[PDB]
Design a protein around this motif. Structure first.
Motif, PDB file in Angstrom:
ATOM      1  N   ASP A  40       0.672  -1.124  -0.087  1.00  0.00           N
ATOM      2  CA  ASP A  40      -0.115   0.104   0.068  1.00  0.00           C
ATOM      3  C   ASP A  40       0.799   1.130  -0.116  1.00  0.00           C
ATOM      4  O   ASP A  40       0.286   2.438   0.155  1.00  0.00           O
ATOM      5  N   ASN A  41       2.254   1.114  -0.125  1.00  0.00           N
ATOM      6  CA  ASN A  41       2.967   2.432   0.063  1.00  0.00           C
ATOM      7  C   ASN A  41       4.141   2.272  -1.063  1.00  0.00           C
ATOM      8  O   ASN A  41       4.261   1.135  -1.930  1.00  0.00           O
ATOM      9  N   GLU A  63       6.669   5.981   3.626  1.00  0.00           N
ATOM     10  CA  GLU A  63       5.467   6.361   4.160  1.00  0.00           C
ATOM     11  C   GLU A  63       5.064   7.852   4.196  1.00  0.00           C
ATOM     12  O   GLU A  63       5.777   8.462   4.771  1.00  0.00           O
ATOM     13  N   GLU A  64       4.199   8.377   3.451  1.00  0.00           N
ATOM     14  CA  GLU A  64       3.622   9.658   3.349  1.00  0.00           C
ATOM     15  C   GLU A  64       2.295  10.000   4.105  1.00  0.00           C
ATOM     16  O   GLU A  64       2.309  11.429   4.380  1.00  0.00           O
ATOM     17  N   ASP A  65       1.743   9.164   4.474  1.00  0.00           N
ATOM     18  CA  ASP A  65       0.588   9.093   5.033  1.00  0.00           C
ATOM     19  C   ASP A  65       0.790   9.759   6.509  1.00  0.00           C
ATOM     20  O   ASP A  65       1.372   9.101   7.374  1.00  0.00           O
TER      21      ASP A  65
END
Ligand code: MG
Length: 292
Positions: A40-41, A63-65
């Motif tokens: 998911d990344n 990871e940017e979330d």
């Protein structure tokens, strides 16, 4: 999902094609704990040149979330994949998150040894002096004049290397000298690092990352790395790749027809360790096109 088992299959296929030391147990323990984050990344598979005829194999994710920032460290600590052995490196991620606002973070793994490295990106750039109160290797502060003199003082990211007890600092290329080949030639000469070819110096004026490696054992700057993006297999300068790395460019697994690549050139003391090439395939095809 199917995406998770597809990713682990590709890594083992790479490590076996290009003769990399790997361990299926360690991959299993990593994928159990991080597999979903890989699907998911922003995710990449790395190959590096550190041995004449045997590539190493690594994999990383980014990871940017904003709501997820910090979980990679918590996950890693809980799962036993990252166990702090009291080392100097072990307190740095906690000190970094208290001190600076975090915009992104990441985890690098070794297909034989496991979790190797966690990186944190700062929201904004800071004068590198603002990090001197962290428990960094003493060689950071004792090089503060060198850092200022070479305009490596706009700090924005930390790499914490747990296998090597070292720290990588990333520096924004803000200065007009950063867009000239002579600056890179003179920086490598000033460090007494191995001199690069002329094709590489011309490539380096393009917009890339630059990181410096400090270690708790050594009073010297140990390493330097330039990362550069490339849109696709065509854009890669293959004169700078040995045959084994060129084969990787052509057969590296991705989920896109023409995945981009991130190329890394490590430099160290001339006639010594540390000078090699890293090649990262953009496994999802969305990591590279997000230039600066
Ligand atoms: Mg994410």
């Amino acid at each position: 999902m199917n995406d998770v088992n597809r990713i682990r299959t590709d890594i083992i296929n790479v490590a076996k094609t290009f003769g990399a030391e790997y361990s299926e147990k360690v991959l299993d323990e990593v994928f159990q704990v991080f597999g979903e984050q890989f699907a998911d990344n922003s995710f990449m598979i790395r190959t590096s040149n550190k041995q004449p005829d045997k590539l190493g194999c690594y994999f990383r994710y980014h990871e940017e979330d904003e709501s997820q920032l910090g979980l990679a460290w918590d996950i890693a600590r809980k799962s036993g994949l990252l166990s702090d052995q009291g080392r100097p490196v072990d307190q740095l991620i906690p000190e970094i998150c208290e001190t600076f606002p975090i915009m992104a973070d990441g985890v690098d793994f070794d297909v034989k040894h496991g979790l190797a490295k966690i990186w944190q990106s700062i929201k904004g750039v800071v004068p590198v002096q603002d990090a001197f109160k962290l428990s960094l290797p003493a060689s950071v502060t004792t090089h503060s004049d060198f850092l200022k003199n070479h305009h490596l003082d706009a700090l924005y990211a930390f790499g914490i290397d747990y296998h090597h007890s070292s720290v990588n600092l990333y520096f924004d290329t803000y200065h007009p000298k950063h867009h000239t080949s002579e600056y890179y030639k003179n920086l490598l000469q000033d460090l007494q690092f191995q001199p690069p070819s002329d094709e590489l110096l011309e490539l380096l004026t393009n917009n890339g990352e630059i990181a410096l490696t400090f270690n708790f054992a050594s009073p010297r700057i140990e390493r330097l790395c330039f990362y550069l993006p490339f849109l696709n297999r065509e854009a890669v300068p293959q004169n700078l790749l040995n045959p084994l790395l060129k084969k990787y460019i052509n057969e590296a697994p991705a989920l896109v027809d023409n995945p981009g690549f991130i190329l890394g050139w490590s430099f160290g003391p001339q006639g010594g360790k540390g000078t090699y090439t890293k090649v990262d395939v953009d496994y999802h095809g969305r990591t590279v096109p997000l230039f600066m």
